[PDB]
Amino acid sequence: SMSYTWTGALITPCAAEESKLPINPLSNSLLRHHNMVYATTSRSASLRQKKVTFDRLQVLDDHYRDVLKEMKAKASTVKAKLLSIEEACKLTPPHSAKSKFGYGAKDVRNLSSRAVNHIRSVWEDLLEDTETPIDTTIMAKSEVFCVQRKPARLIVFPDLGVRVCEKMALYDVVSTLPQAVMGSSYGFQYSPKQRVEFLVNTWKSKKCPMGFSYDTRCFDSTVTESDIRVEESIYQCCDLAPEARQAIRSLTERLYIGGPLTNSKGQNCGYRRCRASGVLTTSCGNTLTCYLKATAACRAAKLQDCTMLVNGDDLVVICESAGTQEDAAALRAFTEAMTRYSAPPGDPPQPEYDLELITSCSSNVSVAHDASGKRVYYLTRDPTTPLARAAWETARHTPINSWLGNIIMYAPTLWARMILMTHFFSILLAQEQLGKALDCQIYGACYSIEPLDLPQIIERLHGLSAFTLHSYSPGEINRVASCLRKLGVPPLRTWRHRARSVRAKLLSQGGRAAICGRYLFNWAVRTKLKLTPIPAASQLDLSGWFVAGYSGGDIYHSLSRAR
Numbered sequence: 001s002m003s004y005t006w007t008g009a010l011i012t013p014c015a016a017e018e019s020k021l022p023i024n025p026l027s028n029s030l031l032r033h034h035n036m037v038y039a040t041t042s043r044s045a046s047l048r049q050k051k052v053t054f055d056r057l058q059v060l061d062d063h064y065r066d067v068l069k070e071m072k073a074k075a076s077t078v079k080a081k082l083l084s085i086e087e088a089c090k091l092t093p094p095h096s097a098k099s100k101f102g103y104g105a106k107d108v109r110n111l112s113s114r115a116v117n118h119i120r121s122v123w124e125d126l127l128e129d130t131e132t133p134i135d136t137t138i139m140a141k142s143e144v145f146c147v148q149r150k151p152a153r154l155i156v157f158p159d160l161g162v163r164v165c166e167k168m169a170l171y172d173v174v175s176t177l178p179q180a181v182m183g184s185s186y187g188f189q190y191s192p193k194q195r196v197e198f199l200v201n202t203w204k205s206k207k208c209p210m211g212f213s214y215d216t217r218c219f220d221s222t223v224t225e226s227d228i229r230v231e232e233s234i235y236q237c238c239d240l241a242p243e244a245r246q247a248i249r250s251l252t253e254r255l256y257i258g259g260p261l262t263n264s265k266g267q268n269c270g271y272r273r274c275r276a277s278g279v280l281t282t283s284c285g286n287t288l289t290c291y292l293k294a295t296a297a298c299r300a301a302k303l304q305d306c307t308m309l310v311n312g313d314d315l316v317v318i319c320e321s322a323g324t325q326e327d328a329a330a331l332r333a334f335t336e337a338m339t340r341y342s343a344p345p346g347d348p349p350q351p352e353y354d355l356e357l358i359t360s361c362s363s364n365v366s367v368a369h370d371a372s373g374k375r376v377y378y379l380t381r382d383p384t385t386p387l388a389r390a391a392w393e394t395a396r397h398t399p400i401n402s403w404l405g406n407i408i409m410y411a412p413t414l415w416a417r418m419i420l421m422t423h424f425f426s427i428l429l430a431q432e433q434l435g436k437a438l439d440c441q442i443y444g445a446c447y448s449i450e451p452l453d454l455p456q457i458i459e460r461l462h463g464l465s466a467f468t469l470h471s472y473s474p475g476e477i478n479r480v481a482s483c484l485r486k487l488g489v490p491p492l493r494t495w496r497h498r499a500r501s502v503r504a505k506l507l508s509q510g511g512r513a514a515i516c517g518r519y520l521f522n523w524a525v526r527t528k529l530k531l532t533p534i535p536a537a538s539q540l541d542l543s544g545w546f547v548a549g550y551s552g553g554d555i556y557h558s559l560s561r562a563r
């Protein structure tokens with residue numbers, strides 16, 4: 001069947017759209033080549049529609065069926081709870097898209113009578129009605145990139161009332177089932193330090209390792225109605241409350257398998273027969289589907305001792321080599337099996353014999369040295385996209401701050417420490433906003449974080465070595481330096497000068513600012529301050545941070561204020 005059918009109505013914006021980076025003094029201090037930075041808009045939506053619209057041909061075999069049964073036997077150990085309305089309302093982001101039924105995200109979080117009444121009625125409708133397709137809105141996503149232009153990605157989501165009901169029925173399932181099924185292969189259970197540890201240990205556990213990343217082109221579009229029903233068959237192995245079992249059954253048939261598409265003007269836009277990017281099950285379902293297809297394909301290809309690391313559609317495979325010619329033919333057989341399963345590649349996969357040459361979740365393992373000179377492995381990436389997005393976020397207030405999420409996840413990197421920490425701490429200190437909570441996302445979930453709490457968060461996610469790394473690899477240094485020339489970012493010597501200045505001001509303020517000065521900026525001086533475990537680090541409640549993926553799932557994980 002076709003992934004989409006279109007009526008001809010356009011994918012429309014709901015307000016004015018900006019595509020060009022503004023010429024602003026604060027963003028210009030970071031990045032001077034503003035014309036290289038752009039944001040996608042609904043103007044390129046038709047280009048994206050063409051790429052995501054195609055017929056799927058799926059052929060399943062015995063390897064696929066055997067893997068499915070093994071996955072279902074693991075899912076059969078799970079007991080999942082139904083969330084109460086209050087618990088589901090607390091998980092709603094403060095700025096989640098308002099309902100078309102006269103209430104918004106603030107009303108949901110406050111348990112307003114109108115919000116609660118509508119949610120109760122949507123819930124009863126899922127219990128009673130197993131067939132009526134649920135309406136979805138289709139919008140073009142606004143994302144920032146550097147030139148060499150990508151068309152806008154498309155987001156498809158149901159009304160706010162439906163989203164709260166999805167959490168009641170499935171929040172506990174999507175949060176616990178993936179690790180029960182995939183074990184150590186489920187990527188979202190790891191902090192960045194645990195992810196590097198798993199990759200390094202897996203690589204070194206093989207007698208002769210071979211690894212590859214597998215990129216599926218337009219993954220959401222490759223997901224069939226059969227894949228979505230198979231995903232439900234896994235969820236159905238859980239012990240569930242009867243209302244949850246009915247709501248999952250109704251959500252699968254009325255929403256997850258497909259449905260009508262409506263634009264921002266209320267016009268009928270088309271029909272979807274593939275994965276919706278903006279539903280609670282998107283990350284869990286994509287992870288399960290990608291793992292199932294890859295595990296079965298590994299057996300069809302005769303790849304030896306395949307260890308997967310899966311995060312939604314992102315897949316990395318580490319296995320036992322059989323020699324270069326054998327591995328090359330086995331990888332082609334893996335690709336042919338994935339294609340039969342309706343997961344064709346974007347870029348054809350390449351066998352790799354060095355762990356540092358593999359790119360997974362846009363990142364690669366690199367090496368630096370700690371204070372004692374000991375080798376430390378860490379995850380880095382090309383800093384182009386993070387710097388272009390940090391420049392945009394400096395010139396325009398955006399709801400989600402990728403710069404903050406990049407500092408958290410990429411804290412040990414030369415670019416996050418020297419550029420991002422230096423730039424944002426300087427601006428925030430000058431605006432007296434170091435203590436102001438800002439939103440960021442970790443594995444798709446939204447968090448409200450104060451920049452002053454960064455040292456203890458970094459210590460927990462990466463260890464104290466994140467504040468002591470030096471002697472970065474020449475390859476890493478060259479990649480950063482070349483990206484700065486390309487974007488017109490001032491050189492690292494300038495960032496070291498700016499860091500010494502903000503560090504002195506942070507130290508002069510005492511308290512939490514001085515902890516930021518001491519730990520975050522120790523790299524900028526020869527006269528190093530002594531770095532001991534931060535007391536607040538052991539008291540940090542990071543439950544929920546690295547449990548599961550929630551991209552498109554409309555999840556908020558920061559504490560709810562009492563009433």
Ligand SMILES: Nc1cc(Cn2c(C(=O)O)c(-n3c(=O)[nH]c4cscc4c3=O)c3cc(C(F)(F)F)ccc32)ccn1
Nearest residue numbers: 192311312314361363379402405406409441442443444
């Ligand atoms: N492409 C992907 C990435 C992922 C998982 N994922 C995400 C994510 O946004 O979900 C990261 N991440 C965040 O969780 N918050 C963020 C805020 S701004 C940038 C990120 C970011 O990269 C992230 C960082 C790393 C590390 F390498 F750092 F370990 C590894 C995997 C990561 C799965 C599938 N495709």
